[PDB]
């Protein structure tokens, strides 16, 4: 649905490179917890046992509405790992829809390199599809349950604002979160939020690769990942191109690898020397595509003026992480098996440049990886 979701606006907080989170309550009576919003996974899991980096955690023994599934689960992430016990309980989202649903919950009892010290989040809400749920696809993911048990429409939208805060609009599309119009790309397959990139540009200049290279072996939208991550081949070409475009200043070879910071006196970052990056995505009409363009203010992340280069290599395909998303209002329109992009009303920019979403472009031919 469309309108004004004034109670849901600004319901996200983050700690800069540590993830965006929403407040949720579980159990009876309600226990409160901060939950990482992760479009790149499908399990709802919460710490359920003391751990050095948890201020609080879920206490199953205090919930009258708790139920044990008498089954264990473990998950490894691109980053870390946790193990737990499956169960169900009542779940609410205070600054969300006014509903309460029964959902599956992994009670996290052991973990390594998962809970980030000082992140202030205690759990994870995987918003992807059941196909990538652990132990298997029979564990209904949270959002599925929310849609089946209430009249919340099958759809949510995300405006992540860098600098961390933002908005998770559950069930609708809030028009005050974007300017211009919304462009949609088909979701290739309901597992991850898979999309297809058909062309890449650095400051208008085409990288000029077979478009299969761009989606090998998949391209995804993943709010649980900080960086823009590109297949090694695409990554090398892009960094070459980006180096060429910012030559008026030279940087340690290890800046381009994420291994070193770079700094400028306060408020003098030479943004203009850095090119803009553009991904063309497949449109909904045949042979049409559209373009999203991000600024250096997106791929150069600030670090407690200092910056880390937030584009990196991947062997698991393209991950359009938070670097990409912070430019845009992103609509995960699941009812319609599409994802929408519009210019974020909150994205960070200077006076000379802004993120963009333009289209349509005629595009010939095939870009998706097949098994």
Curated annotation (Swiss-Prot):
Membrane topology summary: Single-pass type I membrane protein
GO molecular function: amyloid-beta binding; aspartic-type endopeptidase activity; beta-aspartyl-peptidase activity; endopeptidase activity; enzyme binding; peptidase activity; protein serine/threonine kinase binding
EC number: 3.4.23.46
Primary localization class, coarse: membrane
Peptidase A1 domain ranges (all copies): 20-342
Enzyme class: hydrolase
Chain positions with N6-acetyllysine modification: 71, 208, 212, 218, 232-233, 240
Gene Ontology CC annotation, any one: lysosome
Subunit structure comment from the entry: Monomer. Interacts with RTN1; RTN2; RTN3 and RTN4; the interaction leads to inhibition of amyloid precursor protein processing. Interacts with SNX6. Interacts with PCSK9. Interacts with NAT8 and NAT8B. Interacts with BIN1. Interacts (via extracellular domain) with ADAM10 (via extracellular domain). Interacts with SORL1; this interaction may affect binding with APP and hence reduce APP cleavage. Interacts with NRDC AND NRG1.
Name under which the protein is recorded: Beta-secretase 1
Source organism (scientific name): Homo sapiens
Gene behind the chain: BACE1
Full-sequence range covered: 56 to 447 of 501
